[PDB]
Amino acid sequence: TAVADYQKAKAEFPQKQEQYNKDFEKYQSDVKEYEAQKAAYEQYKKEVAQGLASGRVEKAQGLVFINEPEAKLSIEGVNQYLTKEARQKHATEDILQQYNTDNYTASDFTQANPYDPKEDTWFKMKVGDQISVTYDNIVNSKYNDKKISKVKINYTLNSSTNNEGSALVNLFHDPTKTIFIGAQTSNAGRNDKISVTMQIIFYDENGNEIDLSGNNAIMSLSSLNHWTTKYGDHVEKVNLGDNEFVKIPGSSVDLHGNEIYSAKDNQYKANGATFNGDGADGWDAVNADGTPRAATAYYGAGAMTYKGEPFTFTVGGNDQNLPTTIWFATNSAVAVPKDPGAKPTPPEKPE
Numbered sequence: 001t002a003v004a005d006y007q008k009a010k011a012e013f014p015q016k017q018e019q020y021n022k023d024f025e026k027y028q029s030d031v032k033e034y035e036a037q038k039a040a041y042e043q044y045k046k047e048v049a050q051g052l053a054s055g056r057v058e059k060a061q062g063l064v065f066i067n068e069p070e071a072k073l074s075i076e077g078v079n080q081y082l083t084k085e086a087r088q089k090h091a092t093e094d095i096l097q098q099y100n101t102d103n104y105t106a107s108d109f110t111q112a113n114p115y116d117p118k119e120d121t122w123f124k125m126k127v128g129d130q131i132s133v134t135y136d137n138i139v140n141s142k143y144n145d146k147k148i149s150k151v152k153i154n155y156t157l158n159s160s161t162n163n164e165g166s167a168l169v170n171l172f173h174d175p176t177k178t179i180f181i182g183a184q185t186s187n188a189g190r191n192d193k194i195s196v197t198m199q200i201i202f203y204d205e206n207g208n209e210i211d212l213s214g215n216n217a218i219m220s221l222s223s224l225n226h227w228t229t230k231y232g233d234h235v236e237k238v239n240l241g242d243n244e245f246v247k248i249p250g251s252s253v254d255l256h257g258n259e260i261y262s263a264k265d266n267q268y269k270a271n272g273a274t275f276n277g278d279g280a281d282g283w284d285a286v287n288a289d290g291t292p293r294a295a296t297a298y299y300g301a302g303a304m305t306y307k308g309e310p311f312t313f314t315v316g317g318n319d320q321n322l323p324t325t326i327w328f329a330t331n332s333a334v335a336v337p338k339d340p341g342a343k344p345t346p347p348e349k350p351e
């Protein structure tokens with residue numbers, strides 16, 4: 001028994017030290033992350049408490065526009081819907097290949113919408129051609145206690161990364177999930193981009209457009225990834241136009257001119273990021289509904305006071321042949337720093 005115990009402890013000890021080593025490196029990593037989250041949270045709590053500009057996220061928010069799972073689509077200005085057959089044919093493909101516009105041909109598109117208003121719709125957008133999407137059956141949303149009955153979003157593709165002046169769009173029937181857009185990156189040199197200008201109009205129950213001049217419509221501009229690898233210097237940017245930037249404390253995202261983005265890589269700790277974006281517990285992890293999985297989502301986020309005026313998102317920087325994609329969603333779910341909990345404690349040294 002003493003022998004059994006002894007030989008087991010001896011035999012297991014190498015493994016226990018291996019695991020200890022792993023757990024300690026994790027602890028050291030976790031503490032840097034914890035300190036960062038804690039710093040961001042404390043600054044956020046201060047800004048809310050003291051009424052600094054970033055506190056407007058909690059103090060000025062009159063918009064509730066986060067979950068509209070019953071919304072249905074009415075679309076004007078789209079000429080090239082993806083056929084159901086083509087959608088089906090690409091549904092098993094990896095996301096990048098799904099948005100590789102080189103893998104679609106003209107026979108994959110039709111001028112007649114095959115999608116029910118109640119379902120996510122796929123189409124090719126064309127550079128310069130504004131589309132107008134009306135979303136109604138809006139059940140959960142309001143602005144300053146005006147129930148929202150309908151939302152209209154205009155979208156305009158300004159440029160693409162492909163050489164066809166086009167991008168493939170998955171348009172969510174839920175307007176709070178917005179748009180998933182992508183195209184092949186046809187050219188080398190990382191200087192092409194997908195750029196979409198949008199404008200969102202909310203309507204009240206009487207069908208009138210809602211005046212946002214009370215500056216209570218705080219909208220998320222989350223998941224502005226910037227990664228830099230051998231495969232690209234991929235940067236997601238928003239030009240806020242006449243809307244106002246709301247800085248998220250601790251965020252990698254800041255104002256550079258009238259564009260917001262992360263000036264440095266915010267995707268890989270290996271590239272200097274505070275948090276990794278990738279994986280099920282990376283800062284950029286999302287549910288199918290687009291809702292962040294991660295308390296650290298603030299890190300790749302900004303926000304805006306949305307004044308009802310156009311804004312433009314852009315993504316670009318991929319190397320040639322790596323399709324450029326962005327799920328761009330804006331809604332009232334601003335990603336702010338959250339309570340990181342207890343400081344992680346070092347693991348017990350096995351002895």
Ligand SMILES: OC[C@H]1O[C@@H](O)[C@H](O)[C@@H](O)[C@@H]1O
Nearest residue numbers: 221222223286290327328329
């Ligand atoms: O930035 C747009 C969106 O990108 C997606 O990853 C998710 O739906 C959100 O985290 C974000 O709001």
Ligand SMILES: OC[C@H]1O[C@@H](O)[C@H](O)[C@@H](O)[C@@H]1O
Nearest residue numbers: 223225277284325326327328
């Ligand atoms: O890390 C995953 C990310 O991929 C990017 O290409 C898209 O912009 C994001 O919306 C998503 O946030």
Ligand SMILES: [Ca+2]
Nearest residue numbers: 223224225327
């Ligand atoms: Ca993103």
